[PDB]
Ligand binder design. Structure first.
Ligand code: ATP
Ligand code: ADP
Ligand code: ADP
Ligand code: ADP
Ligand code: MG
Ligand code: MG
Lengths: 113, 212, 228, 113, 43, 371, 239, 407, 203
């Protein structure tokens, strides 16, 4: 599974936004990264970013990102209904509510098609 | 009023011209043959004439020409024009006054009939392949500042450096200094001199089965 | 300075027979090794098609029951040189009844090679390797179109002779058994020249002082193929 | 697609605003592009095929079968837009003479050695 | 190269303009007379 | 922009339907266009550049907004640069618009000089496609792997860490389709196509050869994704001409990084090529174009006779048969001359005998010599 | 130093004039010879009888021995010259040597003649190649080819001339490693090769057969057409 | 057969039509005419100008400067009269316009103005006020590399001695002048690179340019060879002046065989002009006046062809030989090329090296690439030893490529 | 030249005047015609007449004019000749005495040409590449066709050949009448006898 940062390949460009002015988990680019992880790693049933750091990455997003980022997992787990459906449970009972909304949509989006 | 100095490349031709500029205190005109070529048809004659006029105005003046064969080739058309202008601003219709020319080249066979006339370049100074003692003197001159070893057999170096030119001997000294650096030695020695000689020398081609 | 050997260049080199060395280069390679046990020659056929009879290409020949030959260059001129070497051996033996020294065979072939501008055609565009035995020692020799010849212990001629010669130089020493020298030659020819060994495009010929029979290697390469 | 595309008409409010999740509508269109060949048991059967663009050439109001500028690829192979594949050898017969998606093959009995 | 021939034409024309009365004379000096165009060499 | 390609060619109502579809769409264009602010920006800039504006050449840039400009009278002026001019679009030799009164730089003009290479930029590849060529499949895959795939999908090579191949030679008897294949690959990937015919780079002027090849590579790299074709490379391939060879070889292998421009070179006498120009480092792909075989010949006959009206009696196999005696260009010649022969006897529907005598006459005109 | 001659070498060592002789041979018509299990067969094509021409006079197949035969392809004047030399050599060898002629000896003689003709100034080389088939390989059939470079080789089956590139591959396509049983089968294969004629008609192919013990045998057009019919019947099996 | 009478073509193009002919050709003419109507209706396409992003530019400062400053003309200065040195007076040359006698402004100073010096001048008084840099020929100044290639010395394989000896001359004195000066030695100033094509000479030049840190100028044979006489010599003059402007500089000539050809005369004058250019160069490298801190690199495939004066030490002090790589060098370059790829870990490269004949490094990169295409055509994401052996076979047999002249 | 004029009328006029048939037939139009015959046999006259009637522009460049004294000029001049050909659009290109460059080339010695062949192969590429063959045709004339080579004659290249034999009795009559039409003849003139008394006239 590819990494959104690696798709951006910030490791090679001249990162002209860096040092002091990059040390924040700001909402917008985090939502972009979650969408990229969902799209690029869609249907492959696995991820390295939002599987090991599943809860942790969610904790650093905010507001509508939770409804988005969690649902992102559903695209990775496409048509393995018993795959995603065993993976969304940890978020089906999440303390967070917006990520619960994202997970409750990911459950359905896994069954799409 | 004309001195054509010549020899194989590697002798002291340009060095001797530079020394003459250094010591004679004259208003010295240094230049190379291609400088007078130029693009437009009538220009080359104009530079030649204007350089001679400037030499006239600076009266105690010396004109040095380097690489005659660039324009001095025997019979393009403009290079011919430039060298004709040089010929007649130097030999015909009241030359001399106090302008002296010095000429340097490696291909005297190329120039033949036009410039080499006794009237134009009165002296023809051959620069020979430097002699054994001459080669030793050249290496000593170039190695003065080298802080060489107190025992360096310059005679043996000259013996091994047959066919070597003065520039090649200077390269031998420089290469000996480089090899002394690669050893980290604070003063270069004789063995560095054979190593430099091996560096400067040719490749000896290869054994040719033709003759065996 | 292009018409023939009768013209001298400013450097003295005749600008006709350097092209004869280059004609040596265009030919397929040949390898020769001189050992105390025996003298061996290896040769590549450069076989155009299997429909060819591989033995029809006479790039490995038997000069006499005590001397074999390989060569590189032009095949017709090589065959003419081989024919002369054979008739020279025949005549000298029939007259004097003493064995022809291999060096003498090289001398005779070289003396023929000196017949393009030395009497009254063109240099023989082929270089030869001889491997023979005699009453005083087993020898290997090489000669070229120029008519010069030399005693070699391990020589390579023809196309890509440089790499094969370098490998042969690196593997050779004065105390090799003929088996180890042969095997080194085969593995070298396999790695650098074309491919794995096979009877269709490679040939071997060995000579021993006490063996005037079966001067070649034939229909027994099998034991090599599995154990190479 | 159509939901996402009509939504994007007010991108500041819909997508850049409150409703990023709307993008997930394209998962309703989620379909992979490939060829996978099976035998009649429906187990995978890797088969050499001829892949390339589609033109009619010598087909004028007739046969359009022309895989032009083709490569030889052993199945499975991905099929970008405009790509077509044809059985490289007639040793098989396809169940359906439209080689897109999952297809099944059978041994040709009419073909003889 | 072109202007050389154009001015040579002017040379021929102008010195063909010498009227018999004129007290003007011509001397040309050269070191390679062969290169000279035969145009001048004519009577 | 251009029209779509209608791909029935027989006169059928499918062709019609495609046509009136196109007419519908263009008529909507007409409708829409017939059924019919920034004055602040204009009033500042297009009034600062008070009409008229002269056209000159930029020589050097000295300060952030100060540059030297020459004009057609040849004079040189140190002038200022107004802020709206794109500095990155300015370089020595660039054509620049200037205020008439104060010669101030007021913008870059898109280049309209270097006429000859501007003409050889052609870009007029769309007359053919991989469709138009049949049977050259091995060659097609080879050139696709060498030049077409790195342009369309350099991702494979970058992911593999591979620097893509950087030179292709096509060779074979003439009329085998080398030029056609080059034009076809230029059509498949719409990268800019550059063609220059062999001897035409040989020039009387001493500099013009290497200079011409230098400017051609300069324009090629300027267009960035580009393919340059040198047909009959033999004319140069087999001191001055050798110096043009050295220039081309160094433009291929030498200093700097070339980037994306691909090189196709077609020869009829490949064995006469000098070793230097066939660089193993650069030219790793040599593609032979053999004389077409039975299958390829059949494909070429179908391709060329496809657009012609044919009778029933034509048995293509007797035309295909015998041996590999001829190439695709000869096949086109047979098709054309059979068309003329059918025309003389007043057939608009060519028959088998037409092709038979056509191939016979072509083989007569093919080669010559006393027995 | 380019070629310009016969006895000088290019700087890379190649003699260009022998290559030019090879090209002159390449201009000639097809000639495909084979040797079978016991018999040797030959078929020449492109007769092209020009109506007023009578084909027999040209003699595209010539026999110069008690038993050996084939012409030499290229320029037919050199072919007739070498024909006369082969007649003289075979008769002289049979008269002078204790035992009769063998195919290897005559092949070597022709190769040496070509070489000695090439190896001199002012002597134009014979630009003709040939395919020699003989009987006395100790009572076995065998085939040789002769190349204007003064060179000779021993083929199981070879082709020279206009179809040299093609028919050879055809041979490489189907020269059966099984020795051809019923050498009539090898003759049918030769007829199939002759179907690749310059005119490809097959109605004017001149064929010779010699069973390594027999004398020269000549195949008439009708009986050769019989083998052509058998080959066509074999070809029609693809249905 | 009689020629096509007008009735014959009429019936030919009438009887043979389908029942569609009229409609579809008429519709095609409507295609063309409607296209032309669309083109005339939309008008011509706006060619536009520069005009950087709108928020970036203008300000009233633009118009204020336009109406306040002066569009200075450019003039060659000459012959400072200096009649009394209280007001010196100067001569200026406005190209193809005129020649004037002028004075300085209230801003500039006499020390700021020299002879020549390419000064600027006002448009009506022609008073001199700006110090301008000299005219460097554009086709000479674009020759400066301005961008380092992505190659380091570690990418060069096998030639340890060659890279060491070349860095001794082109890199060490610039990096560590102290070693030479405190030992009191003058380092070499000219290095020639020679060897067979494709051995890595231009690669070594790229590595040097990447590690130079000083002003690096590439030079190609075609650049020097102009058409007009003396012009190439002129460009080399300007190039050496440019090199003198930089605090030290590196000059690289690629394939100096293009110009350095040995002088010959009997060929009806020969090329001559190329000889004149290389003669101006041979003077610039070492003639009158010291060259300066200019270290120079030449690489050529024909070392013997260059004129002996160019081979001469003092201008070409150190000559380096790039021979065909040895077995160890072949292994090293195979490693270097295989670094970038996605391959098997267990590729026994020294095997591939000993399969290689006397192959140049260009051949090594070629076979590595051919393995890359083998892997890609197989669609595998890992190149295997089988791919490398097919690549070796392909490259070697391709280079090897009737031939009955053999044995 | 009625037979010759009818053949050339077909080959040249029929494509330019009636392209549709070739579009209807699908075959590309023939590119050019070669003319051969003894000098003075109205070859240039006939080509000029065809240029006039088909309303296409006439451009003439002789093969002797092609040679030039410098390499790289014949190629340039031929390519730009076809540049004028394309920019004039419907036109015919004449190469009178193309055999001057379509001739035997020096096969080694104290010198060589190497540029006649180069101009030949440049023209050969230009007409082989059918460069914008829309209403553009080429025509060449050769004296004694035997000296010409088949390089330009190879099938996909120039397609048709025309022979211009010396005028016969009737042709001599026609030429006499045509040229003497302006002349002031006198009663008693019998041009038939003059035509008979001139066997093998060259026109
Ligand atoms: N006799 C000598 N004494 C001292 N140095 C010498 C002598 N001969 C040559 N050299 C050295 O040779 C180098 C080059 O000198 P110079 O330029 O005069 O050579 P040249 O023979 O005129 O060469 P070219 O004709 O190629 O310009 C100098 O560095 C100089 O020190
Ligand atoms: N395989 C082919 N398919 C279609 N047309 C071909 C083919 N080979 C040759 N041709 C015809 O030959 C011409 C191209 O000849 P080509 O070999 O490209 O010329 P060159 O030898 O100058 O490269 C075209 O007009 C084309 O119609
Ligand atoms: N010793 C080597 N180490 C690494 N790469 C090499 C070596 N030799 C050659 N190459 C590769 O082959 C190419 C050789 O080009 P090069 O020999 O520099 O051209 P030129 O012969 O014109 O100087 C380089 O691009 C380089 O990538
Ligand atoms: N059949 C003819 N009818 C009328 N005039 C002719 C005829 N043949 C030759 N001529 C005249 O002779 C001249 C021949 O010129 P040209 O056509 O250039 O000859 P060629 O083509 O052989 O060089 C023409 O000017 C023409 O007027
Ligand atoms: Mg000097
Ligand atoms: Mg005429």
């Amino acid at each position: 599974p590819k990494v959104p940062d690696d798709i951006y390949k910030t490791h090679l460009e001249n990162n002209r936004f860096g040092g002091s002015g990059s040390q924040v988990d700001s909402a917008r680019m985090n939502l972009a990264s979650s969408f990229v992880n969902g799209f690029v790693n869609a249907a492959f049933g696995q991820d390295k970013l939002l599987t090991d750091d599943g809860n942790k990455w969610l904790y650093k997003n905010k507001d509508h990102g939770m409804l988005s980022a969690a649902a992102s997992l559903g695209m990775i787990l496409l048509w393995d209904v018993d795959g995603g459906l065993t993976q969304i449970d940890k978020y089906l009972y999440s303390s967070e509510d917006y990520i619960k909304s994202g997970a409750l949509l990911a459950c359905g989006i896994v069954n799409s098609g | 009023k004309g001195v054509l100095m010549y020899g194989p490349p590697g002798t002291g031709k340009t060095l001797l011209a530079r020394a003459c500029a250094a010591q004679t205190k004259a208003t010295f005109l240094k230049l190379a043959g291609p400088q007078l070529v130029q693009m437009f048809i009538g220009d080359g004659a104009k530079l030649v004439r204007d350089a001679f006029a400037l030499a006239k105005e600076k009266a105690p003046s010396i004109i040095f020409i380097d690489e005659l064969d660039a324009i001095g080739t025997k019979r393009d058309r403009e290079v011919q024009r430039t060298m004709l202008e040089l010929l007649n601003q130097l030999d015909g219709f009241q030359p001399n006054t106090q302008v002296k020319v010095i000429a340097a080249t490696n291909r005297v066979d190329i120039l033949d009939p036009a410039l080499l006339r006794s009237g134009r370049l009165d002296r023809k100074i051959e620069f020979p392949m430097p002699n054994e003692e001459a080669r030793a003197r050249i290496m000593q001159i170039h190695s003065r500042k080298m802080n060489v070893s107190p025992d360096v057999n310059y005679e043996e170096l000259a013996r091994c450096t047959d066919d070597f030119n003065g520039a090649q001997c200077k390269a031998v000294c420089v290469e000996a200094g480089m090899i002394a650096l690669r050893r980290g030695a604070t003063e270069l020695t004789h063995e560095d001199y054979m190593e430099g000689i091996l560096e400067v020398q040719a490749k000896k081609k290869a054994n040719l089965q033709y003759y065996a | 300075y292009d018409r023939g050997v009768n013209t001298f260049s400013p450097e003295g080199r005749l600008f006709q027979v350097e092209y004869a060395i280059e004609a040596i280069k265009l030919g397929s390679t040949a390898i020769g090794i001189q050992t105390s046990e025996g003298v061996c020659l290896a040769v590549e056929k450069r076989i155009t098609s299997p429909l060819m009879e591989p033995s029809s290409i006479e790039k490995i020949v038997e000069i006499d029951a005590h001397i074999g030959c390989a060569m590189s260059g032009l095949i017709a001129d090589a065959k003419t040189l081989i024919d002369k070497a054979r008739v020279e051996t025949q005549n000298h033996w029939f007259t004097y009844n003493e064995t022809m020294t291999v060096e003498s065979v090289t001398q005779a072939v070289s003396n023929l090679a000196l017949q393009f501008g030395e009497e009254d055609s063109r240099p023989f565009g082929v270089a030869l390797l001889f491997g023979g035995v005699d009453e005083k020692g087993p020898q290997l020799f090489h000669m070229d179109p120029s008519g010069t010849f030399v005693q070699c212990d391990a020589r390579a001629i023809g196309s890509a002779s440089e790499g094969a010669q370098s490998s042969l130089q690196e593997v050779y020493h004065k105390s090799m058994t003929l088996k180890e020298a042969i095997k080194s030659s085969l593995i070298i020819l396999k790695q650098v020249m074309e491919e794995k060994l096979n009877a269709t495009n490679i040939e071997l010929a060995t000579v021993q002082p006490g063996q005037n029979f079966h001067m070649f290697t034939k229909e027994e390469l099998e034991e090599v193929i599995k154990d190479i | 697609l159509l939901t996402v595309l009509v939504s994007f008409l007010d991108v500041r409010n819909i997508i850049l605003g409150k409703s990023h999740y709307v993008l997930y509508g394209l998962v309703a269109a989620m379909q992979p592009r490939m060829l996978v060949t099976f035998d009649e048991e429906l187990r995978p059967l890797p088969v050499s095929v001829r892949v390339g663009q589609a033109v009619d050439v010598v087909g004028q109001a007739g046969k359009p079968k022309t895989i032009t500028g083709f490569q030889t690829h052993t199945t499975p192979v991905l099929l970008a837009h405009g790509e077509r594949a044809e059985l490289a050898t007639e040793e098989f017969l396809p169940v359906t003479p439209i080689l897109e998606g999952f297809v099944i093959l059978r041994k040709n009995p009419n073909y003889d050695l | 190269d072109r202007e050389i021939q154009r001015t040579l034409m002017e040379l021929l024309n102008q010195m063909d303009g010498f009227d018999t009365l004129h007290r003007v004379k011509m001397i040309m000096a050269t070191n390679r007379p062969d290169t000279l165009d035969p145009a001048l060499l004519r009577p | 922009s251009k029209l779509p390609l209608v791909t029935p060619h027989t006169q059928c109502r499918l062709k019609l339907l495609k046509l009136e579809r196109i007419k519908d769409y263009l008529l909507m264009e007409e409708e829409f266009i017939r059924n019919q602010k920034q004055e602040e920006e204009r009033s500042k800039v297009d009034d600062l550049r008070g009409t008229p504006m002269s056209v000159g050449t930029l020589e050097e840039i000295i300060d952030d907004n100060h540059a030297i400009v020459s004009t057609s009278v040849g004079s040189e002026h140190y002038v200022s640069i107004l802020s709206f001019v794109d500095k990155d679009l300015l370089e020595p030799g660039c054509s620049v618009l200037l205020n008439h009164k104060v010669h101030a730089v007021i913008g870059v003009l898109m280049d309209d000089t270097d006429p000859l290479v501007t003409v050889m930029k052609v870009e007029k590849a769309p007359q053919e496609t991989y469709a138009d060529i049949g049977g050259l499949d091995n060659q097609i895959q080879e050139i696709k792997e060498s030049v077409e795939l790195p342009l369309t999908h350099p991702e494979y090579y970058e992911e593999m860490g591979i620097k893509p191949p950087k030179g292709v030679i096509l060779y074979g008897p003439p009329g085998t389709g080398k030029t056609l294949l080059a034009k076809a690959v230029a059509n498949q990937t719409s990268a800019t196509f550059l063609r220059v015919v062999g001897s035409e780079l040989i020039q009387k002027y001493l500099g013009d050869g290497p200079k011409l090849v230098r400017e051609l590579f300069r324009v090629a790299e300027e267009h960035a994704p580009s393919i340059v074709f040198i047909d009959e490379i033999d004319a140069i391939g087999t001191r001055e001409i050798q110096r043009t060879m050295l220039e081309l070889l160094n433009q291929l292998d030498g200093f700097d990084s070339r980037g994306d421009v691909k090189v196709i070179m077609a020869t009829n006498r490949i064995e006469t090529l000098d070793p230097a120009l066939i660089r193993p480092g650069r030219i790793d792909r040599k593609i032979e174009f053999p004389l077409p075989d039975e299958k390829t010949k059949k494909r070429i006959f179908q391709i060329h006779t496809s657009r012609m009206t044919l009778a029933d009696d034509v048995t293509l196999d007797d035309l295909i048969m015998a041996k590999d005696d001829l190439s695709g260009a000869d096949i086109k010649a047979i098709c054309t001359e059979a068309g003329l022969m059918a025309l003389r006897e007043r057939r608009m529907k060519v028959t088998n005998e037409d092709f038979k005598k056509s191939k016979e006459n072509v083989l007569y005109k093919k080669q010559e010599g006393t027995p | 130093s380019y070629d310009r001659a016969i006895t000088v070498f290019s700087p890379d060592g190649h003699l260009f004039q022998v290559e030019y002789a090879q090209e002159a041979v390449k201009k000639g018509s097809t000639a495909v010879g084979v040797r079978g299990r016991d018999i040797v067969v030959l078929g020449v094509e492109k007769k092209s009888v020009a109506k007023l021409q009578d084909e027999r006079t040209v003699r595209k197949i010539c026999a110069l021995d008690d038993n050996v035969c084939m012409a030499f392809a290229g320029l037919t004047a050199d072919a007739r010259i070498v024909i006369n030399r082969a007649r003289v050599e075979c008769q002289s060898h049979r008269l002078t040597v204790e035992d009769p002629v063998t195919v290897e000896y005559i092949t070597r003689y022709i190769a040496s003649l070509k070489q000695r003709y090439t190896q001199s100034n002012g002597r134009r080389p014979f630009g003709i190649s040939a395919l020699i088939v003989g009987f006395d390989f100790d009572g076995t059939p065998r085939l040789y080819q002769t190349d204007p470079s003064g060179t000779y080789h021993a083929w199981k089956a070879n082709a020279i001339g206009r179809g040299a590139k093609s028919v050879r591959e055809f041979l490489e396509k189907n020269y059966t490693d099984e020795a051809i049983e019923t050498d009539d089968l090898t003759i049918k294969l030769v007829i199939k090769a002759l179907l690749e004629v310059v005119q490809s008609g097959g109605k004017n192919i001149e064929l010779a057969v010699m069973r390594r013990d027999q004398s020269l045998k000549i195949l008439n057009p009708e009986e050769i057409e019989k083998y052509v019919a058998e080959i066509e019947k074999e070809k029609e099996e693809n249905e | 057969i009689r020629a096509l009478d007008e009735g014959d073509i009429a019936l030919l193009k009438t009887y043979g039509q389908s029942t569609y002919s009229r409609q579809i050709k008429q519709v095609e003419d409507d295609i063309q005419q409607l296209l032309k109507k669309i083109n005339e209706l939309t008008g011509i396409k706006e060619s536009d100008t520069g005009l950087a992003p709108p928020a970036l530019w203008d300000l009233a400062a633009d118009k204020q400067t336009l109406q306040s400053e002066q569009p200075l003309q450019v003039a060659r200065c000459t012959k400072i009269i200096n009649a009394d040195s209280e007001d010196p007076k100067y001569i200026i040359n406005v190209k193809q316009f005129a020649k004037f006698v002028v004075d300085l402004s209230d801003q500039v100073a006499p020390t700021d103005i020299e002879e020549g010096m390419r000064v600027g001048v006002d448009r009506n008084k022609y008073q001199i006020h700006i110090p301008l840099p000299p005219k460097i020929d554009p086709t000479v100044t674009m020759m400066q590399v301005e961008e380092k290639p992505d190659v380091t010395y570690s990418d060069v394989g096998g030639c340890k001695e060659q890279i060491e000896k070349l860095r001794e001359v082109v890199e060490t004195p610039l990096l560590h002048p102290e070693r030479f000066v405190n030992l009191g030695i003058e380092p070499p100033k000219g290095v020639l690179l020679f060897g067979p094509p494709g051995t890595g000479k231009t690669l070594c030049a790229r590595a040097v340019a990447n590690r130079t840190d000083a002003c690096f100028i590439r030079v190609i044979g075609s650049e020097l060879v102009q058409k007009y006489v003396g012009e190439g010599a002129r460009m080399v003059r300007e190039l050496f002046e440019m090199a003198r402007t930089k605090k030290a500089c590196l000059i690289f000539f690629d394939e100096i065989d293009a110009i350095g050809g040995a002088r010959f005369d009997d060929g009806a004058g020969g090329d001559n002009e190329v000889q004149r250019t290389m003669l101006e160069l041979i003077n610039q490298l070492d003639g009158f006046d010291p060259r300066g801190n200019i270290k120079v690199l030449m690489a050529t495939n024909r070392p013997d062809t260059l004129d002996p004066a160019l081979m001469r030490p003092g201008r070409l002090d150190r000559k380096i030989e790039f021979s065909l790589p040895d077995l160890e060098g072949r292994t090293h370059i195979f490693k270097i090329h295989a670094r970038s790829m996605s391959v098997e870990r267990d590729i026994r490269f020294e095997l591939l090296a000993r399969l290689c004949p006397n192959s140049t490094g260009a051949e090594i990169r070629s076979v590595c690439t051919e393995a890359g295409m083998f892997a890609i055509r197989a669609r595998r994401k890992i190149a295997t030893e089988k791919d490398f052996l097919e690549a070796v076979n392909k490259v070697i047999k391709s280079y090897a490529k009737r031939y009955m002249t053999y044995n | 030249l009625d037979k010759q004029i009818k053949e050339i009328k077909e080959v040249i006029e029929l494509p330019v005047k009636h392209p549709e048939l070739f579009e209807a037939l699908g075959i590309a139009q023939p590119k050019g015609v070669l003319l051969y015959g003894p000098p003075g046999t109205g070859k240039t006259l006939l080509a000029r007449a065809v240029a006039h009637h088909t309303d296409c522009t006439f451009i003439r460049v002789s093969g002797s004019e092609l040679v030039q004294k410098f390499i790289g000029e014949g190629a340039r001049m031929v390519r730009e000749l076809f540049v004028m050909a394309r920019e004039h659009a419907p036109s015919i290109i004449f190469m009178d005495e193309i055999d001057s460059i379509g001739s035997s080339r020096l096969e080694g010695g104290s010198g060589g040409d190497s540029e006649v062949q180069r101009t030949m192969l440049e023209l050969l590429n230009q007409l082989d590449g059918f460069e914008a063959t829309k209403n553009i045709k080429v025509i060449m004339a050769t004296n004694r066709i035997d000296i010409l080579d088949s390089a330009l004659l190879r099938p996909g290249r120039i397609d048709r050949k025309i022979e211009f034999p010396p005028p016969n009795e009737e042709a001599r009559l026609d030429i006499l009448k045509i040229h003497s039409r302006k002349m002031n003849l006198t009663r008693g003139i019998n041009l038939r006898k003059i035509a008979e008394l001139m066997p093998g006239a060259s026109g």
